[PDB]
Amino acid sequence: MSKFYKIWLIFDPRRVFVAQGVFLFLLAAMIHLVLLSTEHFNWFELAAANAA
Amino acid sequence: MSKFYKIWLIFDPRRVFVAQGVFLFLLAAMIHLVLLSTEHFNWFELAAANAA
Amino acid sequence: MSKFYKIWLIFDPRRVFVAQGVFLFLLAAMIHLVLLSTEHFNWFELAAANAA
Amino acid sequence: MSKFYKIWLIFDPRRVFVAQGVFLFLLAAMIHLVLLSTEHFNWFELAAANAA
Amino acid sequence: SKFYKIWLIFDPRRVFVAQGVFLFLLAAMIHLVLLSTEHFNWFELAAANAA
Amino acid sequence: SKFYKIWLIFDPRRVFVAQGVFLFLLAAMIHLVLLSTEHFNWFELAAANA
Amino acid sequence: AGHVYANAEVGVTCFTCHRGQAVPSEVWYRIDPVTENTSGWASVQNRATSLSQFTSLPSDALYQYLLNYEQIAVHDLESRVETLPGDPTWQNTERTYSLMNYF
Amino acid sequence: MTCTITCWGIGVLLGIMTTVGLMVVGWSFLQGAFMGVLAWLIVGGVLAVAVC
Amino acid sequence: MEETFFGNFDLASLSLWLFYGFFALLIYYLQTENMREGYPLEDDDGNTAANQGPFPLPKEKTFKLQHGRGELTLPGEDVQRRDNLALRKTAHGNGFPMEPTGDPMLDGVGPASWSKRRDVPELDAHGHPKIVPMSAAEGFGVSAGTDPRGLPVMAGDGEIVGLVSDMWIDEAEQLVRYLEIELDPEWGDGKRLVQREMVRIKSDRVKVRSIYGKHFKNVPKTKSPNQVTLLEEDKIMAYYAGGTLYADESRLEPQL
Amino acid sequence: ALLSFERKYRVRGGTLIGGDLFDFWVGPFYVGFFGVTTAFFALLGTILIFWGASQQGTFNPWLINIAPPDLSYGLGMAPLMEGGLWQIITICAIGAFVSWALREVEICRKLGMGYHVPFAFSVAIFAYVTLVVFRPLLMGAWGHGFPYGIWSHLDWVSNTGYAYLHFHYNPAHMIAVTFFFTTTLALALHGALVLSAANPPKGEEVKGPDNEDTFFRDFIGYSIGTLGIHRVGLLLALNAGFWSAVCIIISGPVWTKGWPEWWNWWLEMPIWPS
Amino acid sequence: PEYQNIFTQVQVQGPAELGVDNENNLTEERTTGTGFSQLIGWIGNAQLGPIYLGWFGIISLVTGTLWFNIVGFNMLSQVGYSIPEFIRQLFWLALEPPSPEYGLRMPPLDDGGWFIIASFFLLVSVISWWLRSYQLAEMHKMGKHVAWAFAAAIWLFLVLGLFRPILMGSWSEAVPYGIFPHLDWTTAFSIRYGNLYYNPFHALSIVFLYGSVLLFAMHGATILAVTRFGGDRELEQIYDRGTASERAGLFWRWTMGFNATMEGIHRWAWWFAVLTPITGGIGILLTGTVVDNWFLWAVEHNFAPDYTQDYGYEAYTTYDGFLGR
Amino acid sequence: DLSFTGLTDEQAQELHSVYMSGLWLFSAVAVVAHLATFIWRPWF
Amino acid sequence: DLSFTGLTDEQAQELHSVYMSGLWLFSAVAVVAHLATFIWRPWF
Numbered sequence A, B, C, D: 001m002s003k004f005y006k007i008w009l010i011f012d013p014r015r016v017f018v019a020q021g022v023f024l025f026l027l028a029a030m031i032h033l034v035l036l037s038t039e040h041f042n043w044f045e046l047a048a049a050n051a052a
Numbered sequence E: 001s002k003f004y005k006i007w008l009i010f011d012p013r014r015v016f017v018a019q020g021v022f023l024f025l026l027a028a029m030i031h032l033v034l035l036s037t038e039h040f041n042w043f044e045l046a047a048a049n050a051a
Numbered sequence F: 001s002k003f004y005k006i007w008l009i010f011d012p013r014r015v016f017v018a019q020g021v022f023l024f025l026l027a028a029m030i031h032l033v034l035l036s037t038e039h040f041n042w043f044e045l046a047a048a049n050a
Numbered sequence G: 001a002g003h004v005y006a007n008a009e010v011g012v013t014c015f016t017c018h019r020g021q022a023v024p025s026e027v028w029y030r031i032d033p034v035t036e037n038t039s040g041w042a043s044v045q046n047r048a049t050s051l052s053q054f055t056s057l058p059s060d061a062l063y064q065y066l067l068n069y070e071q072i073a074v075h076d077l078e079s080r081v082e083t084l085p086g087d088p089t090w091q092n093t094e095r096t097y098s099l100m101n102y103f
Numbered sequence H: 001m002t003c004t005i006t007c008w009g010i011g012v013l014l015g016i017m018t019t020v021g022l023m024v025v026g027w028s029f030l031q032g033a034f035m036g037v038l039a040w041l042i043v044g045g046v047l048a049v050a051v052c
Numbered sequence I: 001m002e003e004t005f006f007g008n009f010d011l012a013s014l015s016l017w018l019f020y021g022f023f024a025l026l027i028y029y030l031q032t033e034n035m036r037e038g039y040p041l042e043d044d045d046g047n048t049a050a051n052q053g054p055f056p057l058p059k060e061k062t063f064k065l066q067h068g069r070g071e072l073t074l075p076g077e078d079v080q081r082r083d084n085l086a087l088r089k090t091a092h093g094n095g096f097p098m099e100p101t102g103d104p105m106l107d108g109v110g111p112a113s114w115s116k117r118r119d120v121p122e123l124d125a126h127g128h129p130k131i132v133p134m135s136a137a138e139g140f141g142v143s144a145g146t147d148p149r150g151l152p153v154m155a156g157d158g159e160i161v162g163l164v165s166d167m168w169i170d171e172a173e174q175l176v177r178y179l180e181i182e183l184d185p186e187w188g189d190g191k192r193l194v195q196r197e198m199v200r201i202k203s204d205r206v207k208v209r210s211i212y213g214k215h216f217k218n219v220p221k222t223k224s225p226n227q228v229t230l231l232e233e234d235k236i237m238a239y240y241a242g243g244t245l246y247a248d249e250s251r252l253e254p255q256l
Numbered sequence J: 001a002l003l004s005f006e007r008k009y010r011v012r013g014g015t016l017i018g019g020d021l022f023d024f025w026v027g028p029f030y031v032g033f034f035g036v037t038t039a040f041f042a043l044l045g046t047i048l049i050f051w052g053a054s055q056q057g058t059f060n061p062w063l064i065n066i067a068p069p070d071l072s073y074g075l076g077m078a079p080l081m082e083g084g085l086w087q088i089i090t091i092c093a094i095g096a097f098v099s100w101a102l103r104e105v106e107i108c109r110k111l112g113m114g115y116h117v118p119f120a121f122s123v124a125i126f127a128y129v130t131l132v133v134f135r136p137l138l139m140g141a142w143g144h145g146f147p148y149g150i151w152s153h154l155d156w157v158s159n160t161g162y163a164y165l166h167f168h169y170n171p172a173h174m175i176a177v178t179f180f181f182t183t184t185l186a187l188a189l190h191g192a193l194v195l196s197a198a199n200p201p202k203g204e205e206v207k208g209p210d211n212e213d214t215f216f217r218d219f220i221g222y223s224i225g226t227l228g229i230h231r232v233g234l235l236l237a238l239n240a241g242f243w244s245a246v247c248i249i250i251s252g253p254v255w256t257k258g259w260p261e262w263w264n265w266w267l268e269m270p271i272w273p274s
Numbered sequence K: 001p002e003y004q005n006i007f008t009q010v011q012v013q014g015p016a017e018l019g020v021d022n023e024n025n026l027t028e029e030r031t032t033g034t035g036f037s038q039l040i041g042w043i044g045n046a047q048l049g050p051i052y053l054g055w056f057g058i059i060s061l062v063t064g065t066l067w068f069n070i071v072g073f074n075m076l077s078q079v080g081y082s083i084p085e086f087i088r089q090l091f092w093l094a095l096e097p098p099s100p101e102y103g104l105r106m107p108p109l110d111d112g113g114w115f116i117i118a119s120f121f122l123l124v125s126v127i128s129w130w131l132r133s134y135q136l137a138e139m140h141k142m143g144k145h146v147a148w149a150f151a152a153a154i155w156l157f158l159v160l161g162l163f164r165p166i167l168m169g170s171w172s173e174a175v176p177y178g179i180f181p182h183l184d185w186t187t188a189f190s191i192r193y194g195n196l197y198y199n200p201f202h203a204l205s206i207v208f209l210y211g212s213v214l215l216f217a218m219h220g221a222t223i224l225a226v227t228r229f230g231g232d233r234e235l236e237q238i239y240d241r242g243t244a245s246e247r248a249g250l251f252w253r254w255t256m257g258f259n260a261t262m263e264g265i266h267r268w269a270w271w272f273a274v275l276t277p278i279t280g281g282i283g284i285l286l287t288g289t290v291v292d293n294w295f296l297w298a299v300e301h302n303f304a305p306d307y308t309q310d311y312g313y314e315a316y317t318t319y320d321g322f323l324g325r
Numbered sequence L, M: 001d002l003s004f005t006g007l008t009d010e011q012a013q014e015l016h017s018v019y020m021s022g023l024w025l026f027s028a029v030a031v032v033a034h035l036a037t038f039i040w041r042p043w044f
């Protein structure tokens, strides 16, 4: 576990960070879109609903 | 920590600046659009509603 | 057994890690999506039902 | 037979292991999906049925 | 008695992979043939024997 | 007779693979035809006897 | 009334089809022998006539279906059926297609 | 080219003129277009052969 | 025919699965037949790669080459490999672009890279060289379009380097393959060939936008002025396309 | 890995908006700025399809069906489970397709080859674009796009085809189909020509361009040549894609009536002696 | 902009190329007259080559004209030899197959009897043309790929008009010889037997038909992209590959992760083209004979989508609202 | 002593230290963001 | 000594130890995750 730094001995930092950067934004959009799809967690609908 | 400046040692400042500039505007345009799609957060329609 | 380390003499660590990284996330995603398909384990709908 | 080891003199270990790896998961996924198709062994509705 | 001479004609690499997919497709086909049958369907029997 | 001269005409490698595919496809076809028939369907017949 | 009074109370009057002329428009006659030197199915369809909706579909569809009570359905109600003589064919489908194109 | 391209240009201009010329005296756009297209093929080909 | 066997698996289903098995064999056959060139795989260091893919290399097929050029077996020992490439890796790992050590266009490494083809001219059915100057052609002449002979040649940067002296035609298929450029003494010497597919012919001048004025003096030459070998033919074509990326930094650098 | 000749061609440069930041290869694939956006858009669109499949209740690839909203919603955004997800996947699909074409520009720019392939793909993109965003705007409702299902989008073609009363009489469909059949006819003959010349009967020398050039001269009396077939074939396929775009863009917003009734101009002309 | 190799900017014309010839001695049956056309030369070869007057070709041409004429004179007899009406209804007239109440028996001339005669001559012409392709490849010492690719088109051609009607029990299952009528038959065939969208072999043929157009746009553009490296000379690139084959391969290796060779591309190109009528021929052959309703076949095999929304316009709008009143 | 990227242990340790520092900071904000949403609308 | 990837016998042994250590850490998180889900909503 303490030797996890060796991942950079096999993966180029400027080649996996592009993959790492894309993957995070892919998630950040994915769950946000999933939440907006649900009726309970759609914060845009809730503001309209709370306004009566 | 404070050693985040090393990102420029592996990522070119010119290309990152252009890439984030496109990304930031596309992010800004997209979020402005989803606000317009919602009836509650469409500031253009609300002015019509308050006009009565 | 203790001689499982020889898989890296057959498989390139670089290509396996990206292969399992893609495989694990896809497996992680589809198991999550399978749960959301079921009405019993859909934690988004359960939260809505609990609020009532 | 004690002489089954000679299969590796015929088959390339790299191609076999990749082919076996994808085959085993596709085997595992299919059998899991067959259980999900049956009403008796689908543990997702069984959890719902037990919870009544 | 001397069937071993088949490998003098057939390439062992091509034959072994040939029956490797053939034998599995025998298992897949026959297993699904049983599953289609109402009698030899162990998944349906377990539901039936559950009562 | 002396039918062994067929191998002077046909390539043994080319005819054995063709025969192997033909023999299995013929066997599968004949087996499948019996399944379609009501009298010789051993799966349906076994259910009938039970 | 199950048809004229289908959705609302909108009936049929003498003006509904005549529309101010003695002979109501869009009336049809039997022109089944559409083309010469033909008989059977070849004699009703291979031409663009008034009854065919600008198509080469049969022109006898109105006569056979709206006047002679011929069978309009052509589909088979099972995935596999024993196709026996007398069953509807693609010619009958083509004629039904001609009638229903007029609809 | 040059002469052939110009001769084709004369035909398409003539085809457009015939398209609207027959529309004035009746006909329809589609009926006039066919004569206009037909005129473009005929006089355009004849001019591209005889003049050039 | 109209009756089903073991379930809903009728003859249509049997034909469908029979095609599925045939298609899988066909894809294996089709994919393998494409592995006769460029295989086995390698890494950026030139060694044999640990991964060769799921498709094994096919059995050796032989082509009986014509005009007495021997035979040819595709799988194994590509004779077209170039030995001394003027490149070195920009990264210690794999998957990263190479940076040329010297002049990319002169060394022919990037888009300017050629392939070590045969050093003999391509032959038609008669055995004669396939591409010859129109001066040596028996009864060939321009039938349509603008004749570029005598028109000045304008480079990518607008410089005038010379006038077209001749076009190297393909008498076997009756089309123009090259234009001969007689370089002015300022911009070079001798004659050079530019492929027709890289040149644009206008009414008064003929222009190439891929190569600047200063790079014509370094265009690869031909040993003989009457025929071009496949090696020279590959070097000449590659050089012009290499200038689409190496004529100036503006082409290599990002456009936005 | 790399092919036996790939090392030289792997040089830096030839990027549109990206630089050395994204100028690298992942396996055989080339990543660029537009390969980054392709990966993001394709993964987001693919995941959202399976997310919609999960909420649809089935994961069967045949039965997965993400459909556009109702026509009552107009051109505005719909609820995610009521058609809004289809709109986002469409936005992701447009981004994935455009970036893929722009990435192909980066591929060919790095290799010094022409831009014919990205242009040819753009025609196929235009056929998809005219099906999902152009035709709906001309009708004022996003619900006219085809649903994102393996068999659901076949129902849309069937219903849209019969929504114009025997679509076979559509003049642009008539032109588009005969381009599709000719392209396959041209593909078969061209593929046969090269294979036949390169693969003669055993014990025979391989045939050069002259032998294959004269084969159709003896076959159909005219051979278009080795170079001619590729350019005419590209135009045959691009015309098939372009005229397919036309036949569907003129269906609703141009000719709301039946397609056989379009041919009434030919049947009813003054020249014809009625 | 850079010169795109779509239209040649200059073309040269020399002595006409007759042919290569060998001891098979194709010259006697080869025409001695050739012509040149500059209009077609902007995109391809400008030479109108000489026909090889073989006996398979002559028989195919003569019997093909007989089928063409027989259909034509029946069409001319449809409208009573009225040429203006014949021209007006040219796209609508046809030679209809026999009525279904005749079976395989020979029907009267006015009720499909001339259809059988025309079909027989068409069958002879089509087969003779295939024999011409096979013989021409044999006489040129070339591969028979043209003959085999053509034979795939014959398969669907024979299934549509010969094989299926024979084992369907009636000649009425054949396709009418008309412009619009065989479009009507195409639609009525799908309607009668459910929906050919749900025919898996129709779907498979569509997969290869789109793939065939897809490949030949891919191959057409890729070769034109490497034509600056002599990529149009595919045959020489097969025997001795240059940078044209390498760049074309690396374009698709860097794009979609795998590529082909300059020869392996045409094997891919050949098979999708060949598979388009082979799969379609199978689907038509077992349509009606085996499966009489394809949507119901889809329903029982669980690949027909199900829709939970209402099927009426009243459920989405109203008649007054649609009219705007 | 394999190094596919040509990075020494000291170079990788320094580079991994910053990456984990960023990873914890990115996850720390996510934990706070997730905590606020659970207070707003719990999903359990 | 068989080595298709060029790694030595000792190089693969050390790489496997870290990979297996990561595998156990990934599995340990999943095991804790499964228990929390089982307590929240069992599936047996």
Ligand code: BCL
Binding pocket: A020, A021, A022, A024, A025, A026, A027, A028, A029, A032, A035, A041, A043, B004, B007, B011, B016, B020, B023, B031, L026, L029, L030, L031, L033, L034, L035, L037
């Ligand atoms: C449902 C209740 C809340 C909600 C609950 C949550 C929760 C809970 C969380 C978020 C999180 C996030 N939410 Mg939210 N969120 C909601 C509504 C929104 C709305 C909105 C308009 O309504 C927006 C804009 C966001 C946006 C965000 C992002 C700030 C963040 C996820 C980061 C990511 O995906 O990409 C990040 C990935 C990247 C790699 C992007 C790369 C792009 C940049 C420009 C690259 C620059 C790199 C360059 C080299 C410079 C480097 C410099 C470095 C400093 C060294 N949320 C609703 C209202 N949201 C998650 C989060 O991560 O928080 C930290 C989080 O935990």
Ligand code: BCL
Binding pocket: A004, A007, A011, A016, A020, A023, A031, C020, C021, C022, C024, C025, C026, C027, C028, C029, C032, C035, C041, C043, M026, M029, M030, M031, M033, M034, M035, M037
């Ligand atoms: C049903 C009840 C719970 C539920 C129960 C569970 C359970 C039980 C589990 C999960 C698991 C997971 N859940 Mg869940 N889960 C639910 C709802 C959610 C929600 C949500 C918004 O509602 C989210 C976001 C998640 C998300 C997750 C992830 C944390 C995790 C899946 C990892 C995987 O598949 O990919 C694997 C990822 C990869 C291999 C790729 C990683 C990509 C990185 C960026 C690659 C770069 C690496 C680079 C080289 C640097 C490496 C450095 C290293 C330090 C060496 N769950 C519901 C609420 N969830 C499963 C899990 O995996 O737990 C660990 C798990 O066991």
Ligand code: BCL
Binding pocket: E022, E023, E024, E025, E026, E027, E028, E030, E031, E034, E040
């Ligand atoms: C309800 C149970 C099903 C059944 C379910 C399966 C399943 C499931 C599988 C097989 C498999 C096979 N079955 Mg079984 N099988 C049944 C009935 C038969 C009968 C028969 C005449 O009834 C025969 C000939 C077979 C033969 C076979 C071979 C094709 C194969 C075994 C390996 C092999 O190839 O060895 C080669 C053969 C020899 C060299 C001699 C060994 C003889 C075989 C193994 C014994 C079967 C003989 C059988 C018991 C005769 C019964 C008659 C008795 C006199 C009453 N089965 C019954 C009907 N069978 C496996 C396979 O690979 O399929 C591709 C598979 O996965």
Ligand code: BCL
Binding pocket: J097, J124, J125, J127, J128, J131, J156, J157, J158, J159, J160, J161, J162, J166, J167, J168, J173, J176, J177, J180, J240, J241, J243, J244, J245, J247, J248, K186, K187
């Ligand atoms: C009842 C039905 C009517 C009918 C109604 C319609 C309707 C309705 C339509 C057509 C359209 C078409 N018809 Mg029609 N048509 C009928 C009968 C026929 C017949 C026949 C023999 O009977 C034929 C051959 C055709 C032929 C065609 C083509 C002209 C066209 C098909 C679409 C196309 O060109 O691509 C165009 C589509 C694209 C090129 C897709 C672009 C793909 C994108 C860019 C890439 C996809 C990437 C994707 C993500 C996959 C990646 C995943 C993996 C990673 C690889 N029709 C029947 C009678 N026809 C369709 C059309 O024209 O569309 C424009 C159309 O909408």
Ligand code: BCL
Binding pocket: J157, J181, K126, K153, K154, K156, K157, K160, K185, K186, K187, K188, K189, K190, K191, K195, K196, K197, K201, K202, K205, K206, K207, K209, K276, K277, K278, K279, K280, K281, K282, K283, K284
């Ligand atoms: C409402 C209409 C039905 C329909 C009904 C049919 C029917 C019916 C058929 C097809 C078939 C086809 N359909 Mg469908 N099809 C529909 C919708 C579509 C759509 C779409 C977008 O909607 C598409 C793309 C297709 C696509 C296709 C192709 C995949 C396929 C034919 C390939 C072909 O050319 O074979 C090539 C072969 C031929 C065209 C004939 C070969 C001709 C011979 C060899 C040449 C003789 C030349 C002749 C003598 C003239 C010579 C003159 C010269 C000038 C000298 N269909 C709908 C469902 N479809 C075919 C099929 O099923 O294939 C399995 C078919 O029979």
Ligand SMILES: CC[C@H]1c2cc3[nH]c4c(c3C)C(=O)[C@H](C(=O)OC)c4c3nc(cc4[nH]c(cc(n2)[C@@H]1C)c(C(C)=O)c4C)[C@@H](C)[C@@H]3CCC(=O)OC/C=C(\C)CCC[C@H](C)CCC[C@H](C)CCCC(C)C
Binding pocket: J038, J041, J042, J043, J044, J045, J046, J049, J089, J092, J093, J096, J097, J100, J104, J117, J118, J120, J121, J122, J123, J124, J125, J127, J147, J148, J149, J150, J153, J237, J238, J240, J241, K210, K213, K214, K217, K218, K221, K255, K256
């Ligand atoms: C457009 C003109 C013709 C053509 C040309 C053509 N297509 C091309 C090209 C060219 C020249 C390429 O260079 C490019 C390529 O690289 O192919 C290998 C491509 C291509 N055309 C393709 C397919 C394709 N082409 C088709 C047809 C055609 N190809 C036309 C006839 C068809 C049809 C009509 O059936 C299909 C399906 C791909 C193989 C490829 C495009 C690859 C691509 O876009 O990759 C990026 C995207 C992904 C990996 C996935 C994106 C997923 C989305 C974000 C979500 C889903 C969206 C989709 C609309 C859902 C569909 C649901 C159901 C309807 C199935």
Ligand code: HEC
Binding pocket: G003, G004, G005, G006, G007, G008, G009, G010, G011, G012, G016, G017, G103, K319
């Ligand atoms: C006497 C003239 C008459 C005849 C003949 C006639 N219709 Fe109608 N039809 C009506 C009337 C009146 C209505 C109005 C019912 C309403 O919608 O409430 C109507 C309505 C309809 C409707 C319902 C439309 C709606 O808005 O729901 C359909 C569909 C219909 N007709 C089809 C047909 C068809 C098909 C035929 C030929 C078989 C036919 N009609 C023949 C009089 C007729």
Ligand code: HEC
Binding pocket: G012, G013, G014, G015, G016, G017, G018, G022, G023, G024, G027
């Ligand atoms: C469905 C529409 C329908 C309705 C209802 C209807 N008719 Fe008719 N009528 C017809 C048709 C069809 C004909 C036949 C055409 C013909 O005879 O010219 C006809 C013929 C007639 C004729 C003969 C016209 C001539 O050519 O001399 C008269 C008179 C007539 N209608 C009177 C009436 C009257 C009066 C009413 C009002 C009660 C009425 N019809 C309503 C359909 C209808």
Ligand SMILES: COC(C)(C)C(=O)/C=C/C(C)=C/C=C/C(C)=C/C=C/C(C)=C/C=C/C=C(C)/C=C/C=C(\C)CC/C=C(\C)CCC=C(C)C
Binding pocket: A013, A027, A030, A031, A034, B003, B004, B006, B007, B009, B010, C025, C028, C029, C030, C032, C033, L014, L015, L016, L018, L019, L020, L021, L022, L023, L026
């Ligand atoms: C569909 O299903 C539903 C249920 C919807 C679903 O949601 C499924 C969800 C699923 C499956 C979750 C899958 C998510 C997973 C697995 C989470 C991965 C996330 C990870 C791992 C977080 C990495 C964070 C790393 C950072 C952010 C570092 C910061 C880096 C810093 C900032 C800079 C780096 C340092 C330098 C550049 C300097 C060094 C350089 C030199 C010294 C030169």
Ligand SMILES: COC(C)(C)C(=O)/C=C/C(C)=C/C=C/C(C)=C/C=C/C(C)=C/C=C\C=C(C)\C=C\C=C(/C)CC/C=C(\C)CCC=C(C)C
Binding pocket: K068, K069, K070, K071, K072, K073, K075, K076, K116, K119, K120, K122, K123, K157, K158, K159, K160, K161, K162, K174, K175, K176, K177, K178, K179, K182
């Ligand atoms: C100035 O000109 C004059 C002179 C007037 C003139 O003529 C002009 C001629 C004019 C306008 C006719 C133009 C013809 C037109 C538009 C028809 C298009 C044709 C089309 C679309 C064909 C579709 C169907 C094709 C199939 C699918 C066939 C199947 C054939 C099968 C395979 C044959 C099988 C054989 C038999 C059934 C025989 C069996 C018997 C024995 C073996 C004995």
Ligand SMILES: [Fe+3]
Binding pocket: J190, J194, J230, K219, K223, K234
């Ligand atoms: Fe080609």
